Design a protein around this ligand. Structure first.
Ligand SMILES: O=P(O)(O)OC[C@H]1O[C@@](CO)(OP(=O)(O)O)[C@@H](O)[C@@H]1O
Ligand SMILES: O=P(O)(O)OC[C@H]1O[C@@](CO)(OP(=O)(O)O)[C@@H](O)[C@@H]1O
Ligand SMILES: O=P(O)(O)OC[C@H]1O[C@@](CO)(OP(=O)(O)O)[C@@H](O)[C@@H]1O
Ligand SMILES: O=P(O)(O)OC[C@H]1O[C@](O)(CO)[C@@H](O)[C@@H]1O
Ligand SMILES: O=P(O)(O)OC[C@H]1O[C@](O)(CO)[C@@H](O)[C@@H]1O
Lengths: 763, 750, 109
């Protein structure tokens, strides 16, 4: 006796709602429920029957993961405020056989759902005591089960780290500022970019970090009244006078001063012009921040949450408090609707009561960290403040492996952070081959790095030459010569190997007797010790967009599939998430290979898909295939085989996005995450001077292989917004499959399954 | 010995860097010396340092750089003769007697007052110490060439100003975003776009975003009645199913009485009608970003001509302004254009808008007309023909392009406007034959197709000859009076096929026209197939990224394979706006001889490098360039010769060249052409109460016309290489071969 | 011997024979000497496009001078490691193209 779940988007729309709706619809049908979509939000509930509470079928959300806003719409709820509205709502749901309601939207919309839930019993009673609903119905569904999914670009719901849409908005913001920057640089102007976020400053902050703004005005740190004019004017002046031709001041739309009075873009404009007397313009991005297609992260986040949201309402009972899906330390979890909204209402209060540190704590797991980081890199060397008393070391940074989005941010961030500490940052150009063959050490000057925070490619250069290949001696020599207290290596598996080599080269060349640390970076995410290498999100988006475009093509011809060659070496990470983000029908990875048996079934399944699809308009199909998923079958040959095996029923073409997979301009995630990894690496350098130092004495038998000295040579990793540290020796000797350049254990085999389910694929 | 100076003044615009880079290199090539002038006039004033001798590599990569890398400041001091004389000294000091100014209409004017006043200022310097009469001798007269760098495209005289299309693209990008959210809340957005006192930007964006209404000065709205006309329009569209409204308002928008029409004036009006309304002012996002393919192309060529014009200067030749008129580059008397543009305001002050509008670019009036007939006249009002209304069929024949939907849309709306019945022949000819599926298109069906790439009704390469009879059977069954074929060579081949089938099939006597559509631009008779611009840009974005990947790893070449079948047009154009050191097309022989001259240029070129950072080089090879030398063999043959000195990689964009979303140019052209075709069908249908009724809509140097498919199917390379016989780019190429750095590398090797 | 007899039968034809020996040109060299191979490519030398062009011209003239005569088939022995880019198959294709109708080449494995 097939039950039913229904979804509705309420409140301000946000990029990724469609991905959410799509997963909920599919997950419900998968679990065996009937899927229902409510048009125009709660209004949809007041109005009723089909057209507004329409039953959906698998093929109805086809392609949705790549569309903006809410295809099921959202309206301002009038009628639902009144009881007759809420009464009609219940009737219509009941008349549709829907007793499971999932709503995606802002907290305001979430609570409305809860209240409705509690008021349900009361409503059905009146409904009965007056007909409208049969007795048979009353019994059949005397309880309403709901679940919330928070979608918003503001990222201001306290119990979740990222609201659906937030990072998409952040992407839109950084894109506009990057445009503004170029004309600004032409006229050496100053721009005040008014950003959204309502009362939260998450967007303004991340944006500022990402775009290297000179100053941000966020409401969680009102700290000012008279302070901000001086605070800002000072650092701006220092920046401009030292070279920077542009001035970018990000202003949260809801910024205020310490006296709780609002600070407007105009307010900031005037000061820039009056006090500093520079050409200034105000820019208000407005809703572009609400539009666009969801960024890979949002698609993937909304897709997973949607799936869980169905699981939640399906296991909710009359006694279970109303659930809400969120993310904590990149982990999909359930949270109690009430506590969550209550904790959010808190922030407003704390702010209304000048207790800013409290409000700041209620934000996301890493809100404060970003703020501190911004501050550092923003000041960096412009203020002698050299936070540490002469405990400042001379640290070197280098790139090894393929370029990747965010490496330049890492460098820039590591350099400018050093400058706020007093450390002297040195860059080794063109890795080991560039060091040994051309003594490529250089002093990273703030002026020379303008823009690096957001540049793709590799400003200092990178290759795959390992230390041993460039002559360890020459390396150690120059090292000693420049007296590097610490090394910071940014790169992929070759950069891993390097760390390893330099460390087991310790005894033999005392110049390496310093702390080292690796900031993993490769769109492949194949470096052990972390769950996220730098450049990953940038590649994932690059590939996703490519795929969107290619599938559109395939849908145009009808009866056609595309085999897209993917990157990632022996790591199916990229193909997997890309696949999940674009709803690829099939995906082949290196860890699994392509068995002729599997290929045959996929070809039949695909075959039927097209038959059942008839000539319809958006039925193109994608097959993502990591190159290493098969040395025998290339994307090209694969297409040929499928096309032949297809036998006229449908055909297939190859697609080689190739190197665009490295993307262009690094993504806000890759950028901000780079400066986060960079700073915690400098921190590792300083925090590990002690050990190897008091031992780095004479190269005597005082140097050995004791965890305490080896453990100064580690990889800064991350376990769900965490940050871990692991000796290169631990990783390289027990957790690495070095022979194949990648970790011994894969951490994403589970989602591969989710993906199959969402698209209806078998074994 | 000739030294030349390039300056970039006024508001910056995407493409200026492209422009400067040409001037520098075109100059260096012709033995001159080129000097950059920083911060505009200001720097010209400040003299020395703020004035720099440019090297060949000083501009490497400038094709993909936003704004102007040599800055643009405003200078008060220049307003006084002291400053002017000041500067003039600075130039004479360097032996400079030629100035190339690229910038807004303003800077262009001042640049003339300078040339016409130089000798005079030269005297002063001869006098008051400064320079001897002897020194100041050869540097007696100033050579002045202007380049219009502006996103407003408000320079009467030239059809397009550097940066106008880029800004347009930027507007579309932003409006496309807004659409998502607007659609969700069924709202109405009033979007404000730059344009100074020119509505070109708004007008284009209007058509390119499926706007409900626009507001441009060149057409001041009915001083008191426009708010109802607007409400009326929006209301009507919303009743037909449109959820959100989009009104584009130009900065310079005003009414009959010259009263400015404000975004909020517009907003208020809509609020009055009861619609959830918002206002967005895009602001400077319209000034940033790199140059789109059109501007890079425009800026590079115009930059090359400015140098040539300089070398061709004479005492009496007046100050030339480089422009574009039949999509060919022309020179025009600067003073004339400044006046003609200056006069535009004049007519607006005297409420003589008609006079004004005729002063804008060659196609301005047309566009505006297109916009109205496609958006406002769906009142039943405008041309709702008696009952000689028609059944017009529409098919997509060929590989997907990005303007098919936009075009199908324009044609559908127009049809409905007149009361014609537009039919969609699903899935090309193969589809018709197999299923006879022909659905009538409704206003709401065609919604949002204006920016939807691919083909919503289905498109494939099957040609008409697959069963010419069953086709004819259905054209009749469906009482079609006309046929529009959207597609590439297969479409062109099909049109021919159908023309011939007339003898055996009476129904094929209905008018039939082809709107070329293909990324390849391989359809004979026209210089521009729809979707081409979209492709070129996809290739720009593509190469821009892999270009950056090569620069990152240092010393590396990419062999990039471009589509276009047996027509290297795309290859050539790409190579030019890419700086490719080698472009292998089918038109150009690829023997071991060539490959070697290529390895040479490379190796040699690489001996230098050092600068690194932004030093990645690339080759553009056409899809069919050589059956033997495939993109891979080419890449490996090259590696092996490098001998570890540098690395090679292959790039095969592939199907992304078909695009995701059509570029603003394709979105507008599709609308023009689509309507022009419905008209052509109407005309012939009435002109019948003879193959000229079976034509291809073509564009040749700006002029659009219809060409009988028969006379044309002998300008083709038919059952062979499938492409139009001639080639109109061999000029691009030789130029490209200079700026690219090829010949320069050729020289060093000898 | 057998393959060359073939080539001599068609007239105006050369065979590119893939040879073994990994990175050692020993086998290709002596084989070549023993059958009178016209050209032989080895790992230690490689196949530079320049050398390839001359060999193709020289070969070209050979057949011209040879007219239609009966025992003028030509062999090009190529150790596989003589080139990772050009296989015996691709080599024949390139030669045949460069030949330009004057003579052609086929691969032999
Ligand atoms: O051009 P090269 O340097 O060979 O690298 C190509 C690709 O190989 C990759 C894997 O696809 O390297 P890696 O395995 O180290 O991550 C990508 O990072 C890189 O884009
Ligand atoms: O999708 P298929 O039919 O393989 O076509 C690939 C490409 O070949 C091209 C030429 O490169 O076809 P066409 O010449 O008809 O324009 C492109 O248009 C098309 O994108
Ligand atoms: O069957 P496999 O292992 O591929 O060996 C094939 C050939 O490889 C060779 C080289 O051609 O090995 P080797 O290089 O060690 O001499 C021959 O000995 C052997 O005939
Ligand atoms: O679009 P509206 O109805 O003006 O709401 C805008 C507000 O919505 C938000 O996007 C939050 O949902 C804020 O960023 C913004 O200030
Ligand atoms: O950036 P500014 O100094 O406000 O000048 C803006 C004006 O410049 C232009 O871009 C023309 O160059 C106009 O579109 C715009 O109105």
């Amino acid at each position: 006796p097939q039950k039913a779940i229904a979804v509705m988007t309420s409140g301000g729309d946000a990029p990724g709602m469609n991905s959410n709706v799509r997963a909920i619809v599919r997950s419900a049908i998968f679990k065996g429920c009937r899927a229902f979509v409510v048009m125009e939000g709660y209004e949809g509930l007041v109005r009723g029957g089909p057209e507004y509470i329409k039953e959906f079928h698998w093929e109805d959300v086809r392609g949705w993961s790549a569309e903006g806003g809410t295809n099921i719409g959202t309206a301002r709820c009038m009628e639902f405020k009144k009881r007759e509205g809420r009464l009609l709502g219940a009737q219509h749901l009941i008349e549709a056989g829907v007793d499971a309601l999932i709503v995606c939207g802002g907290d305001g919309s979430l609570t409305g759902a809860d209240l409705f839930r509690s008021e349900w019993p009361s409503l059905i009673e009146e409904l009965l005591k007056t007909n409208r609903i049969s007795n048979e119905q009353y019994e059949r569904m005397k309880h309403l089960n709901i679940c919330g999914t928070v979608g918003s670009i503001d990222n201001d719901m306290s119990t979740t780290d990222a609201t659906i849409g937030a990072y998409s908005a952040l992407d839109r913001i950084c894109k506009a500022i990057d445009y503004v920057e170029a004309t600004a640089n032409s006229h050496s102007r100053a721009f005040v970019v008014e950003v959204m976020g309502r009362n939260c400053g998450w967007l303004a902050l991340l944006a500022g970090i990402a775009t290297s703004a000179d100053y941000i005005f966020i409401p969680e740190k009102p700290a000012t009244s008279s302070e901000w004019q001086d605070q800002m004017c000072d650092i701006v002046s220092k920046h401009r006078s030292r070279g920077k031709r542009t001035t970018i001041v990000v202003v949260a739309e809801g910024a205020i001063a310490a006296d709780l009075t609002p600070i407007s873009p105009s307010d900031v404009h005037k000061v820039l012009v009056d006090r500093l007397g520079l050409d200034t313009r105000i820019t208000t991005l407005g809703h572009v921040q609400r539009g666009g297609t969801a960024v890979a992260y949002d698609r993937i986040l909304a897709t997973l949450q949607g799936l869980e949201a169905v699981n939640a309402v399906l296991e909710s009972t009359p006694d279970t408090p109303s659930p809400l899906i969120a993310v904590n330390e990149n982990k999909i979890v359930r949270k109690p609707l009430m506590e969550s909204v209550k904790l959010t209402k808190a922030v407003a209060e704390a702010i209304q009561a000048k207790d800013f540190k409290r409000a700041m704590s209620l934000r996301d797991t890493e809100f404060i960290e970003h703020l501190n980081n911004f501050m550092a890199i923003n000041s960096a060397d412009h203020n002698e403040p050299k936070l540490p008393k002469d405990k400042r070391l001379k640290i070197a940074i280098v790139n090894v492996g393929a370029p990747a989005g965010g490496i330049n941010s890492a460098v820039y961030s590591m350099a400018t952070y050093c400058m706020s500490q007093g450390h002297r940052p040195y860059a080794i150009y063109n890795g080991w081959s560039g060091l040994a063959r051309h003594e490529s050490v250089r002093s990273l000057n703030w002026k020379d790095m303008l823009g690096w925070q957001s540049r793709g490619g590799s400003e200092i250069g990178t290759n795959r030459v390992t230390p041993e290949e460039a002559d360890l001696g020459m390396i150690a020599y120059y090292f000693q010569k420049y007296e590097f207290d610490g090394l910071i290596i940014v790169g992929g598996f070759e950069a891993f190997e390097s760390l390893h080599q330099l460390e087991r080269a310790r005894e033999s060349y005392p110049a390496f007797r310093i702390p080292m640390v690796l900031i993993p970076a490769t769109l492949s995410n194949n470096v052990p010790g972390t769950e996220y290498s730098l450049g990953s999100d940038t590649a994932l988006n690059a590939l996703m967009e490519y795929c969107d475009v290619v599938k559109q093509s395939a849908s145009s011809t009808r009866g056609r599939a595309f085999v897209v060659d993917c990157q990632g070496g022996n790591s199916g990470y990229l193909a997997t998430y890309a696949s999940l983000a674009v709803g690829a029908q099939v995906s082949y990875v290196p860890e699994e290979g392509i068995s002729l048996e599997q290929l045959s079934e996929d070809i039949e399944y695909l075959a039927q898909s097209f038959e059942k699809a008839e000539g319809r308009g958006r039925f193109g199909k994608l097959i993502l295939k990591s190159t290493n998923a098969s040395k025998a079958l290339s994307a090209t040959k694969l297409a040929e085989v499928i096309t032949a095996e297809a036998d006229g029923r449908f055909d297939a073409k190859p697609a080689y996005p190739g190197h665009v997979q490295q993307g262009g301009l690094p993504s806000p995630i890759d950028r901000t995450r780079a400066t986060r990894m960079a700073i915690k690496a400098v921190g590792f350098i300083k925090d590990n001077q002690a050990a190897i130092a008091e031992a780095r004495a004479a190269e005597e038998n005082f140097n050995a292989d004791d965890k305490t000295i080896s453990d100064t040579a580690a990889v800064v990793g991350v376990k769900g917004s965490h940050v871990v540290y692991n000796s290169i020796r631990q990783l390289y000797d027990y957790e690495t499959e070095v022979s194949m350049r990648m970790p011994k254990v894969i951490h994403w085999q589970a989602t591969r399954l989710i993906a199959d389910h969402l698209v209806g694929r078998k074994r | 010995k000739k030294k030349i100076a390039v300056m970039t003044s006024g508001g910056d615009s995407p493409g200026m860097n492209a422009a400067v880079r040409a001037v520098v290199r075109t100059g260096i090539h012709f033995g001159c010396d080129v000097f950059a002038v920083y911060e505009g006039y200001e720097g010209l004033l400040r003299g020395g340092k703020y004035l720099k001798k440019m090297a060949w590599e000083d501009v490497r990569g400038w094709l993909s750089e936003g704004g102007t890398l040599i800055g643009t400041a405003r200078s008060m001091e220049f307003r006084k003769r002291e400053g002017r004389r000041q500067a003039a000294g600075n130039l004479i000091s360097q032996g400079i007697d030629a100035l190339v100014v690229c910038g807004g209409d303003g800077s262009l004017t001042g640049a003339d007052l300078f040339r016409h006043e130089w000798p005079s200022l030269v005297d002063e310097l001869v006098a008051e110490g400064r320079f001897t009469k002897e020194e100041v001798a050869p540097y007696k007269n100033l050579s002045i060439v202007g380049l219009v760098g502006s996103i407003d495209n408000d320079m009467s005289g030239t059809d397009s100003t550097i940066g106008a299309y880029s800004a347009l693209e930027r507007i579309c990008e932003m409006v496309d975003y807004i659409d998502a959210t607007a659609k969700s809340h069924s709202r109405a957005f009033v979007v404000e776009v730059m344009g100074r006192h020119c509505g070109w930007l708004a007008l284009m964006a209007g058509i390119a975003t499926g706007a409900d209404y626009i507001f441009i000065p060149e057409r001041a709205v009915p001083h008191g009645k426009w708010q109802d006309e607007l409400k009326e329009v929006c209301q009507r569209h919303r009743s037909k199913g449109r959820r959100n409204n989009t009104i584009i308002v130009a900065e310079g928008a005003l009414d009959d009485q010259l009263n400015p029409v404000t975004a909020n004036d517009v907003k208020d009006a809509l609020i009055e009608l009861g619609l959830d309304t918002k206002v967005t002012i895009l602001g400077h996002v319209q000034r940033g970003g790199t140059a789109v393919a059109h501007d890079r192309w425009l800026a590079t060529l115009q930059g090359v001509d400015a140098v040539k014009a300089v070398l061709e200067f004479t005492p009496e030749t007046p100050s030339p302004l480089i422009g574009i008129l039949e999509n060919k580059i022309i020179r025009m008397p600067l003073v004339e254009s400044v006046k003609l543009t200056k006069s535009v305001a004049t007519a607006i002050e005297n409420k003589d808008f008609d006079k004004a509008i005729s002063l804008r670019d060659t196609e301005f009036i047309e566009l505006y007309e297109n916009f109205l007939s496609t958006t406002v006249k769906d009142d039943g009002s405008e041309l709702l023909p008696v009952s000689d209304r028609l059944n017009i069929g529409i098919v997509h024949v060929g590989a997907p392009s990005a303007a098919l939907n936009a075009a199908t849309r324009a044609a559908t709306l127009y049809c409905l406007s007149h009361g014609h019945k537009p039919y969609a022949i699903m899935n090309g000819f193969s589809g018709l034959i197999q299923t006879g599926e022909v659905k009538e298109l409704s206003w709401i069906d065609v919604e949002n197709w204006h920016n939807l790439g691919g083909s919503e009704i289905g498109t494939n390469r099957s040609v008409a000859s697959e069963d010419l009879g069953t086709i004819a059977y259905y054209f009749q069954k469906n009482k079609l009076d006309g046929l529009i074929i959207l597609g590439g060579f297969e479409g062109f081949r099909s049109l021919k096929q159908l023309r011939d089938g007339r003898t055996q099939h009476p129904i094929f006597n209905i008018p039939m026209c082809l709107i070329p559509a293909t990324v390849s631009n391989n359809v004979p008779g026209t210089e521009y197939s729809l979707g081409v611009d979209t492709c070129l840009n996809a290739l720009v974005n593509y190469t821009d990224d892999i270009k950056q990947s090569a620069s990152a790893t240092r010393r590396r070449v990419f062999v990039c394979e471009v589509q276009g079948g047996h027509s290297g047009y795309i290859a050539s154009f790409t190579g030019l706006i890419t700086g490719a050191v080698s472009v292998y097309t089918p038109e150009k022989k690829i023997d071991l001889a060539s490959i070697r001259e290529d390895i040479t240029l490379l190796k040699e070129n690489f001996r230098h490098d050092k600068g690194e950072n932004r030093n990645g080089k690339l080759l553009v090879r056409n899809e069919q360039a050589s059956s033997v030398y495939s993109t891979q063999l080419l890449a490996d043959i090259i590696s092996e010769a490098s001998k570890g000195k540098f690395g090679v990689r292959t790039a095969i964009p592939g199907h992304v060249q078909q695009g995701g979303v059509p570029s603003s140019k394709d979105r507008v052209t599709a609308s023009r052409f689509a309507v022009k075709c419905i008209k052509f069908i109407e005309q012939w249908n009435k002109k019948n109460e003879e193959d000229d009724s079976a034509a291809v809509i073509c564009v040749n140097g700006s002029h659009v016309s219809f060409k009988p498919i028969a006379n044309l199917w002998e300008n083709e390379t038919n059952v062979e290489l499938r492409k139009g016989f001639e080639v109109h780019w061999a000029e691009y190429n030789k130029i490209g071969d200079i700026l690219s750095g090829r010949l320069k590398l050729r020289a060093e090797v000898a």
